[PDB]
Scaffold this active site. Structure first.
Site, PDB file in Angstrom:
ATOM      1  CG  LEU A 231       7.511  48.851  -5.199  1.00 21.22           C
ATOM      2  CD1 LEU A 231       6.987  47.431  -5.128  1.00 21.22           C
ATOM      3  CD2 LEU A 231       6.658  49.694  -6.135  1.00 21.22           C
ATOM      4  CG  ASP A 232       4.690  54.508  -0.234  1.00 16.28           C
ATOM      5  OD1 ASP A 232       5.417  54.547   0.780  1.00 16.28           O
ATOM      6  OD2 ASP A 232       3.692  55.244  -0.377  1.00 16.28           O
TER       7      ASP A 232
END
Ligand SMILES: CCCCCCCCCCCCCCCCCC(=O)OC[C@H](COP(=O)([O-])OCC[N+](C)(C)C)OC(=O)CCCCCCCCCCCCCCCCC
Ligand SMILES: CCCCCCCCCCCCCCCCCC(=O)OC[C@H](COP(=O)(O)OCCN)OC(=O)CCCCCCCCCCCCCCCCC
Ligand SMILES: CCCCCCCCCCCCCCCCCC(=O)OC[C@H](COP(=O)(O)OCCN)OC(=O)CCCCCCCCCCCCCCCCC
Ligand SMILES: *C(=O)CCCCCCCCCCCCC
Lengths: 122, 65, 540, 155, 79, 87, 99, 177, 128
Positions: F41-42
């Site tokens: 994930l970012d």
């Protein structure tokens, strides 16, 4: 509320001021004008302890309404007719005050027409 | 039994709180419409307001000169 | 004679008895708040008999029962004055207080200092009934400083919080700035009329009474949160919700209005005092009701609501109609205490959440709170034949139909529209819309304490305006002949406020982002008045 | 505690400045004292005059109510910049615009009150007329004298 | 003690204004990831809240019925 | 009011939020599931996950602790540290 | 990134000690060990006895003093009958009717 | 800016904090959930539009005008959580957070009301006072010369020893005393 | 384009819009490292004595004792006669005394002139 703009945005010479009026005699235009008849005796309202705002020419209905409001306890809604009598007499007194104001307005219009005819004639 | 809390959904209602809330809403509307029936004048007006321009010069005492 | 004065003093001694109970203790109480709630119930029932035998005749008296101090020409006696104002304010204050304490058995149930809380709340009630039964200015100053000190002690209830002590000290500062004017008034009456007793003040009838009335107006500006000295009442929502419900809606904040109503024979002979009260009251009811239009904390909104209604009271004292102002106090008490109680029920249900931007969906989630808050908002706006109709609309009917400042009248009508605007703002963000609060719904209002406490003030907010307005004797002549655009003024401008603010509320569901201009930043930052004077004046 | 940690006179030589910056437990380059005019501040540092509201509210403070650390040189008005008192926090609206808006609103409203007091509103009616010589005995007139007759007429 | 949570797959955004949000994001080429977490606020027993004129007129039906019955009673009693 | 939360309940609520999230497949999410290293994930998504936790439980996590919660086990442990559960 | 493993092990050990502390904050079923220790009584002790005391004080000490309890005289109407004098107040004039 | 462990916020941490405070002020401006949800995806896309930027000076420039955009589009009263600082319920129960050492100063007749509690507290005190010198000598050799550089405390290392400076962290009061 | 926040003494500049937050030079790195070093050292020296079980008393702060000895005990020896301090000791020390003196003397001369002429309303004034 037209009289506010007629006294402020129009001319002030014909609209009557609230503070100092009537500026005319009482019988100037009234032949055999009767005096107001007082119904309540002065001692009867001195013993009724009425507010001095309320000791006007119609406090006898207020004396009847207060005798009702005392006597009809605890039924606090059983004095509507005495209240409506007193409110109707206050309404008639307010109509008489409106008639005073309109009489002053029409006499100032009469003075305006009188001075304009005097200026155009002489 | 008390009202157990729920998760992400509509909570449990007691019947009594809902019927009392509806009873006081209906009591409000009954009282408003009842007093609007019987009085009808504290909101609308008690006496008719006259017109000062329609008044004659005889009752106000204005002799035309 | 023997019944009236006896039950009058029995109400006050009965209120003082649980103070002796909480002070003469050793053990842990078997629900001392239930004891104080039962005591105030009984004091209300005791005070209702002198009220009924005042409704019957109009029997006023004075109990000058204890000769306390004679300073050479000043006989300071413990003197109580049972007139119309005491007879109509004491049972209303007791009824509201009994409702607040049965609310407080539930709202403050997890408090380990609940005994100190009910002790302080009963001390506040004792000082306020000293304030409204007082016959001389010294005993009225006792009650005045007493409600100021209990304001301090009940705003700083969670004393570990810095902002609570900050708001308490702020409230003390503005009330002492009012105390400057009140001690000025006492000084004028002692030097020029040789008295603090109200009887000799009313009898001697001073003509050059500009200075004592300016002192009383400064006292009311401090106490009733008028313009210049208002911000302590928006700060005073930091305390507990029954504190802001009892004190700062219905009981304490009306004391300056009650002081100016008590001195009506002096204000009715002075056009300058009437003009100052009319201008300052219109200024207050404009400014505070405008600052209510942009808030999101619900207790701030109802604090600006009650301060706007106090400004309306100051207006209808300024038009020389004191009994209508006092009827607006006795009317305002019921539904404004009920609106704070319903807001506190919403706060306690949503886990101490006071922000209306995280509310919603509470129409059917809290149906009794929904019903009672809608009835309270309608009685605030002047819905016909609810309790708020039986004074407030009449105020407008005498604010139009008198030799009056026209701009003060126009600001009063603008404030009347603003009341409807923030009332439907409260209904729209709190009860209407969709849920915006967190996910573990612990929403509950099934306590007989909460139900009965909101229920009795709801019966009050449905019936008490009619009952009190029909039980008074007429002390004025009601203006009942007026043109139809002028009779229908307050209702029409209220409905226009409703509709314009429904437009304002329906703008929020549009997916358009607008930059806030100087109007929203002006009103949202409290008209910029608590920013400068709280940073610049203590700095100098 | 002893002598060489208490506040002393104003520093003149830069090694006295360095010894005082070691004394006040701070950097030498951030050590700036009050202007030497004789007001009696001594070697005490001019802290940047920000209140305790702008200090880090989530930080693990030694004094969490004051938001301050041990040994750090306190402000001269540390009693004044508490969170019960005057703040230094920024507002979204500038100070001068707030002064202008508040003063303009107060002055314009009070001027409109003066204009409306100059130009009153009223009703198209006359004065309220009262019986018995316009209530002479009721307004407190003495009974030994007799006033002028105030008689009103029907209309 | 142990409180059970409901299903996380029942909270889909068909029928909610999250669908309109996702359509206005798709019309410019964006995607909403947090629809299903916001799905409960618009569904279930918190769906179809009343209007303001629907909020004021709560209990108007039974109040109107009580009005008609009591005015009929006082109209039949006054004779 | 304010019911006593348990670690099993807090864990189930955290995983119930994160299974309502469209970038997390509910069969791969575990308690040791790192966001940048097990879910990929970012950091913006990690900020939004912490903000979803804040909107969930009703309090704010400071940024000095929000920048360091990188798996749901640390999120449950931080909520246990700031709520005093299992008393 | 997240925490360093020193910080993670420290939070683990501190969390274990904190949970043992909070678990030890629970009470025994015998704690607290306490030391070994009329239906309308409220209407009697808080109403009737204060009404007795206050009526005694007002009757035999306050009204015995001048001008302490000054009662406003009752409002007299045309049509009243006085209990003290015995004279019936003569009524008002017949009204100049308006409806 | 002001951090316990580190001495500065990185550029990445500045972007995260500005993004999070931007969404909080946005939700303060965007009361309703779906409207905030749409604008939150728009703000996420605008932060994604400048994500893969390699020039650090240009990134600091964009962060500067982003701070101007943030200051221009902020709410006067942002939403604050109640237990969060600035909230309405913040530091409310600090008048109930009584410290533990006052338990050492009770009368014995009110310590006898809770026998098991103080009998269990004495071994906590014993564990503290026989762990203190071990964790002191663990501090004085593991801290480098010239004081500790950062405020981070080390954990324990031996199986049977406690972390240093631990007592008032473990015995700190509850959130609801 | 956008309005700049203009600072105030009572409303200071924020952390974000100040330019010295967005400097990445080496002296800022070293000053932040030095402030971190001194703050960490004082934090450690505090919370050793704070957690010390032998100490049952008050951890004295030399900063707080330094502040209290500054507010009271450094007043007189660091007082020097110059323009600013003497003009403020005259403007704020005897200025308002002269102001209130002439105001009260004017008011009481006015009142005594009205009283000895018999022109002041002193009818029910017998308490004084
Ligand atoms: C709760 C227990 C009560 C007692 C229970 C057991 C006794 C039996 C029950 C009956 C009561 C006792 C018998 C009757 C009482 C005695 C009667 C008597 O002669 O009393 C003598 C006198 C009456 O006053 P007096 O005028 O005769 O004497 C005063 C003395 N000179 C004149 C010289 C100044 O005292 C009292 O009655 C005192 C009663 C006080 C009640 C109120 C107290 C309030 C305290 C406030 C303090 C501050 C006030 C400041 C403001 C004042 C206003 C400006
Ligand atoms: C007292 C009488 C109150 C009722 C008469 C006035 C009603 C009114 O002003 O209605 C106008 C308007 C409703 O119209 P609108 O909302 O546009 O319709 C679409 C769906 N209702 O708006 C409203 O009805 C809202 C205002 C209601 C105020 C009620 C209390 C006064
Ligand atoms: C009929 C006529 C009506 C006339 C009306 C107009 C006249 C009055 C004009 C306004 C006077 C009062 C306003 C100015 C002072 C206000 C001080 C105050 O309230 O400060 C509040 C402040 C904390 O408040 P705040 O920051 O808002 O709280 C947020 C929580 N952190 O608290 C603090 O900062 C604490 C400050 C402590 C030290 C204060 C020192 C100065 C004291 C000033 C006293 C003023 C005396 C005035 C005398 C008048 C005589 C006539
Ligand atoms: C003549 O028009 C003067 C009436 C009094 C002053 C003007 C009042 C205007 C507001 C009242 C009517 C409002 C109708 C919505």
């Amino acid at each position: 509320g037209a009289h506010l703009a007629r006294r402020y945005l129009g001319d002030a010479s014909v609209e009557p001021e609230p503070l100092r009026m009537p500026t005319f005699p009482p019988d100037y235009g009234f032949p055999e004008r009767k005096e107001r008849e007082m119904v309540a005796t002065q001692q009867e309202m001195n013993d009724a302890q009425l507010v001095l705002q309320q000791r006007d020419y119609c406090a006898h209905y207020l004396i009847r309404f207060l005798k009702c409001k005392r006597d009809s306890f605890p039924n606090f809604l059983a004095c509507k007719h005495e209240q409506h009598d007193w409110d109707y007499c206050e309404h008639l007194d307010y109509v008489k005050r409106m008639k005073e104001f309109e009489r002053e307005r029409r006499l100032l219009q009469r003075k305006k027409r009188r001075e304009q005819r005097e200026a155009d004639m002489a | 039994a008390h009202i157990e809390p729920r998760y992400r959904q509509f909570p449990q209602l007691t019947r009594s709180q809902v019927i009392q809330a509806e009873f006081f809403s209906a009591t409000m509307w009954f009282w408003i419409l009842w007093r609007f029936w019987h009085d009808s004048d504290a909101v609308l007006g008690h006496f008719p307001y006259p017109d000062p321009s329609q008044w004659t010069d005889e009752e106000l005492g204005i002799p035309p000169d | 004679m023997n019944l009236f004065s006896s039950l009058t003093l029995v109400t006050l001694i009965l209120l003082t008895m649980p103070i002796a109970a909480i002070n003469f203790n050793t053990h842990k109480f078997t629900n001392y708040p239930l004891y104080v709630k039962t005591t105030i119930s009984c004091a209300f029932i005791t005070s209702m008999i002198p009220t009924m035998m005042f409704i019957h005749t109009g029997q006023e008296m004075i109990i000058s029962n204890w000769h306390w101090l004679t300073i050479q020409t000043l006989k300071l006696s413990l003197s109580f004055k049972m007139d119309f104002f005491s007879m109509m304010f004491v049972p209303v204050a007791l009824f509201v207080t009994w409702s607040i304490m049965e609310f407080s058995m539930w709202y403050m149930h997890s408090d380990p200092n609940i005994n100190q809380f009910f002790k302080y709340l009963l001390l506040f009630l004792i000082t306020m009934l000293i304030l409204v039964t007082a016959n001389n200015l010294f005993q009225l100053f006792i009650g005045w400083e007493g409600v100021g000190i209990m304001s301090f002690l009940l705003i700083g209830w969670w004393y570990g919080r810095t902002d609570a002590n900050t708001a308490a000290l702020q409230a003390i500062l503005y009330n002492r700035i009012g105390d400057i004017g009140f001690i000025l008034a006492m000084a004028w009456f002692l030097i020029n009329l040789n008295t603090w007793d109200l009887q000799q003040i009313f009898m001697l009838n001073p003509n050059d009474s500009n200075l004592p009335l300016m002192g009383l107006i400064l006292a009311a500006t401090g106490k009733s949160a008028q313009f210049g000295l208002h911000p302590w009442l928006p700060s005073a929502m930091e305390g507990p919700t029954p504190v802001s419900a009892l004190l700062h809606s219905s009981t304490m904040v009306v004391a300056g209005i009650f002081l100016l109503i008590r001195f009506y024979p002096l204000t009715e002979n002075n056009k300058f005092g009437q003009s100052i009260m009319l201008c300052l009251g219109a200024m207050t009811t404009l400014f505070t009701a405008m600052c209510a239009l942009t808030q999101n904390d619900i207790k701030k909104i109802i604090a600006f609501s009650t301060s706007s209604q106090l400004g309306l009271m100051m207006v209808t004292i300024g038009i020389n109609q004191p009994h209508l102002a006092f009827l607006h106090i006795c009317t305002h008490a019921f539904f404004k205490a009920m609106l704070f109680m319903c807001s506190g029920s919403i706060i306690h249900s949503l886990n101490d959440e006071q922000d209306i931007r995280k509310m919603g969906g509470l129409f059917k989630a809290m149906p009794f709170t929904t019903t009672a808050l809608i009835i309270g908002s309608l009685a605030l706006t002047g819905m016909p034949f609810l309790t708020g109709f039986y004074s407030k609309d009449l105020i407008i009917e005498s604010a139009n139909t008198s030799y009056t400042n026209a701009w003060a009248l126009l600001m009063t009508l603008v404030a009347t529209s603003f009341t409807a605007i923030y009332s439907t703002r409260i209904i729209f963000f709190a009860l209407l819309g969709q849920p915006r609060f967190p996910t573990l719904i612990n929403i509950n209002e099934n306590n007989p304490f909460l139900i009965n406490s909101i229920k009795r003030l709801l019966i009050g907010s449905l019936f008490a305006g009619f009952i009190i307005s029909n039980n008074i004797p007429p002390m004025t002549i009601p203006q009942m002949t007026m043109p139809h655009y002028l009779k229908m003024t307050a209702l029409t401008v209220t409905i226009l406020g409703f509709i314009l603010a429904l437009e304002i509320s329906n703008t929020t569901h549009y997916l358009k982002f607008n930059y806030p201009s100087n109007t929203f930043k002006f009103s949202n930052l409290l008209g910029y008045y608590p920013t400068i004077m709280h940073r610049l004046t203590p700095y100098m | 505690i002893t002598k060489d940690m208490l506040p002393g006179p104003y520093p003149k030589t830069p090694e006295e400045r360095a010894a005082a910056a070691k004394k006040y437990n701070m950097r030498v380059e951030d050590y700036e004292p009050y202007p030497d005019d004789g007001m009696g501040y001594g070697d005490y540092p001019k802290l940047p005059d920000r209140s305790q509201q702008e200090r880090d509210p989530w930080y693990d403070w030694d004094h969490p109510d004051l938001r301050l650390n041990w040994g750090e040189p306190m402000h001269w008005d540390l009693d004044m910049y508490i969170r019960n008192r005057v703040d230094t926090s920024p507002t979204p609206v500038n100070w001068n615009l707030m002064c202008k808006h508040l003063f303009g609103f107060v002055a314009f409203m009070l001027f409109m009150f003066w204009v409306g007091e100059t130009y009153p509103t009223y009703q198209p009616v006359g004065p309220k007329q009262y019986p018995y010589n316009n209530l002479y005995l009721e307004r407190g007139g003495d009974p030994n004298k007799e006033p002028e007759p105030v008689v009103h007429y029907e209309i | 003690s142990k409180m059970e949570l409901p299903d996380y797959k029942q909270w889909k955004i068909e029928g909610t204004p999250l669908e309109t949000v996702q359509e206005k994001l798709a019309a410019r080429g964006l995607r909403d990831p947090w629809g299903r977490n916001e799905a409960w606020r618009y569904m279930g027993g918190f769906a179809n809240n009343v209007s303001f004129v629907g909020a004021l007129l709560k209990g108007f039906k039974w109040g109107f019925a009580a009005f008609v019955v009591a005015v009929g009673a006082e109209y039949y009693l006054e004779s | 009011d304010a019911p006593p939360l348990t670690l099993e309940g807090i864990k189930d609520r955290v995983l119930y939020v994160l299974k309502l999230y469209d970038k997390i497949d509910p069969e791969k999410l575990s308690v040791n599931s790192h966001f940048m290293k097990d879910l990929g994930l970012d950091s913006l998504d990690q900020v939004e996950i912490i903000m979803a936790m804040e909107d969930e439980f009703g309090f704010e996590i400071p940024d000095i602790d929000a920048e360091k919660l990188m798996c749901p086990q640390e999120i449950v442990d931080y909520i246990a540290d700031k709520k005093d559960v299992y008393e | 990134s997240g925490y360093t493993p020193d910080e993670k092990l420290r939070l683990q050990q501190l969390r274990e000690l904190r949970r043992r502390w909070l678990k030890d904050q629970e009470l025994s079923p015998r704690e607290p060990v306490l030391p070994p220790r009329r239906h309308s009584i409220f209407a009697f002790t808080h109403v009737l006895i204060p009404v007795w005391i206050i009526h005694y004080y007002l009757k035999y000490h306050v009204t015995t003093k001048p001008y302490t309890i000054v009662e406003k005289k009752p409002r007299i109407f045309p049509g009243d009958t006085i209990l003290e004098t015995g004279e019936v107040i003569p009524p008002m004039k017949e009204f100049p009717d308006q409806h | 800016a002001f951090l316990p462990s580190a001495a500065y916020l990185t550029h990445q941490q500045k972007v995260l904090q500005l993004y999070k405070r931007a969404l909080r002020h946005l939700e303060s401006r965007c009361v309703h959930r779906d409207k905030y949800r749409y604008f939150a995806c728009l703000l996420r896309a605008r932060f994604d539009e400048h994500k893969n930027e390699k020039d650090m000076v240009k990134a600091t420039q964009l962060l500067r005008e982003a701070e101007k955009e943030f200051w221009h589009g902020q709410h006067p009263q942002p939403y604050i959580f109640p237990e969060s600082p600035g909230g309405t319920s913040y530091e409310r129960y600090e008048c109930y957070k009584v410290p533990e050492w006052c338990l050492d100063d009770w009368h014995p007749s009110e310590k006898a009301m809770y026998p098991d509690y103080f009998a269990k507290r004495e071994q906590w005190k014993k564990l503290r006072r026989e762990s203190w010198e071990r964790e002191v000598k663990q501090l004085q050799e593991e801290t480098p010369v010239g004081g500790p550089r950062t405020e981070a405390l080390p954990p324990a290392r031996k199986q049977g020893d406690l972390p240093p400076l631990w007592w008032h962290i473990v015995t700190r009061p509850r959130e609801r005393p | 384009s956008f309005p700049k926040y203009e600072p105030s003494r009572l409303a200071s500049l924020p952390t974000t819009l100040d330019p010295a937050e967005y400097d990445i030079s080496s002296e800022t790195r070293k000053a932040q490292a030095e402030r971190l070093a001194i703050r960490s050292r004082l934090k450690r020296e505090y919370q050793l004595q704070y957690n010390d079980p032998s100490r049952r008393g008050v951890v004295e702060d030399p900063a707080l004792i330094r502040w209290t000895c500054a507010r009271s005990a450094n007043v007189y020896p660091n007082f020097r006669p110059n323009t600013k301090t003497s003009l403020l000791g005259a403007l704020f020390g005897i200025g308002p005394l002269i102001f209130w003196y002439y105001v009260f003397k004017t008011d009481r001369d006015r009142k005594e002139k009205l009283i000895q002429e018999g022109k002041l309303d002193r009818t029910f004034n017998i308490s004084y």
